Design a protein around this motif. Structure first.
Motif, PDB file in Angstrom:
ATOM      1  N   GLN A  74     -56.073  62.369  -6.779  1.00  0.00           N
ATOM      2  CA  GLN A  74     -54.947  62.320  -7.154  1.00  0.00           C
ATOM      3  C   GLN A  74     -54.296  61.400  -5.847  1.00  0.00           C
ATOM      4  O   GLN A  74     -53.952  60.546  -5.972  1.00  0.00           O
ATOM      5  CB  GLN A  74     -54.610  63.679  -6.906  1.00  0.00           C
ATOM      6  CG  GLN A  74     -54.657  64.641  -7.917  1.00  0.00           C
ATOM      7  CD  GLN A  74     -53.431  65.762  -7.549  1.00  0.00           C
ATOM      8  OE1 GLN A  74     -52.079  65.999  -7.999  1.00  0.00           O
ATOM      9  NE2 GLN A  74     -54.014  66.519  -7.514  1.00  0.00           N
ATOM     10  N   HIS A 116     -53.752  57.676  -6.955  1.00  0.00           N
ATOM     11  CA  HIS A 116     -52.322  57.855  -7.067  1.00  0.00           C
ATOM     12  C   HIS A 116     -50.970  57.361  -5.757  1.00  0.00           C
ATOM     13  O   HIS A 116     -50.394  56.683  -5.668  1.00  0.00           O
ATOM     14  CB  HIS A 116     -51.776  58.514  -7.558  1.00  0.00           C
ATOM     15  CG  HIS A 116     -52.202  58.918  -9.807  1.00  0.00           C
ATOM     16  ND1 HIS A 116     -52.081  58.098 -10.319  1.00  0.00           N
ATOM     17  CD2 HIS A 116     -53.017  59.913 -10.001  1.00  0.00           C
ATOM     18  CE1 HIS A 116     -53.065  58.404 -11.562  1.00  0.00           C
ATOM     19  NE2 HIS A 116     -53.497  59.578 -11.101  1.00  0.00           N
ATOM     20  N   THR A 117     -51.638  58.485  -5.239  1.00  0.00           N
ATOM     21  CA  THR A 117     -50.848  57.957  -3.838  1.00  0.00           C
ATOM     22  C   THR A 117     -51.336  57.277  -3.340  1.00  0.00           C
ATOM     23  O   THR A 117     -51.138  57.144  -1.500  1.00  0.00           O
ATOM     24  CB  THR A 117     -51.170  59.488  -2.982  1.00  0.00           C
ATOM     25  OG1 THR A 117     -49.754  59.129  -1.752  1.00  0.00           O
ATOM     26  CG2 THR A 117     -52.460  60.025  -2.484  1.00  0.00           C
ATOM     27  N   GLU A 143     -50.350  63.198 -13.265  1.00  0.00           N
ATOM     28  CA  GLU A 143     -50.027  62.095 -12.308  1.00  0.00           C
ATOM     29  C   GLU A 143     -50.452  60.700 -13.740  1.00  0.00           C
ATOM     30  O   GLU A 143     -49.868  60.366 -13.815  1.00  0.00           O
ATOM     31  CB  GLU A 143     -50.960  61.017 -11.557  1.00  0.00           C
ATOM     32  CG  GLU A 143     -50.324  61.517  -9.802  1.00  0.00           C
ATOM     33  CD  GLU A 143     -49.354  60.941  -9.270  1.00  0.00           C
ATOM     34  OE1 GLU A 143     -49.065  60.231  -9.277  1.00  0.00           O
ATOM     35  OE2 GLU A 143     -48.509  62.226  -8.707  1.00  0.00           O
ATOM     36  N   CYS A 167     -54.401  66.419 -13.421  1.00  0.00           N
ATOM     37  CA  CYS A 167     -53.451  65.266 -12.861  1.00  0.00           C
ATOM     38  C   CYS A 167     -52.104  65.161 -12.892  1.00  0.00           C
ATOM     39  O   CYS A 167     -51.578  64.768 -14.495  1.00  0.00           O
ATOM     40  CB  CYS A 167     -54.491  64.385 -12.537  1.00  0.00           C
ATOM     41  SG  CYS A 167     -53.897  63.000 -10.836  1.00  0.00           S
TER      42      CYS A 167
END
Ligand SMILES: [Zn+2]
Length: 46
Positions: free
Chosen positions: A32, A35-36, A17, A15
């Motif tokens: 992921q 994170h978003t 991130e 990832c």
């Protein structure tokens, strides 16, 4: 010098991130999302 290119062989996706390595491409894509998943920056009519 240079010996390998992308790890040893296993297809592990990390990832960008946090940096968590997942043994599944689909599994990561789902991670992921964490994170978003923040306050609404600017949505659209989509
Ligand atoms: Zn992550």
């Amino acid at each position: 010098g240079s010996s390998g290119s992308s790890g040893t062989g296993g297809k592990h996706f990390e990832c960008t991130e946090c940096g968590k390595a997942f043994t599944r491409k689909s599994t990561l894509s789902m991670h992921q999302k964490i994170h978003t998943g923040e306050k609404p920056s600017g949505p659209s009519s989509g």
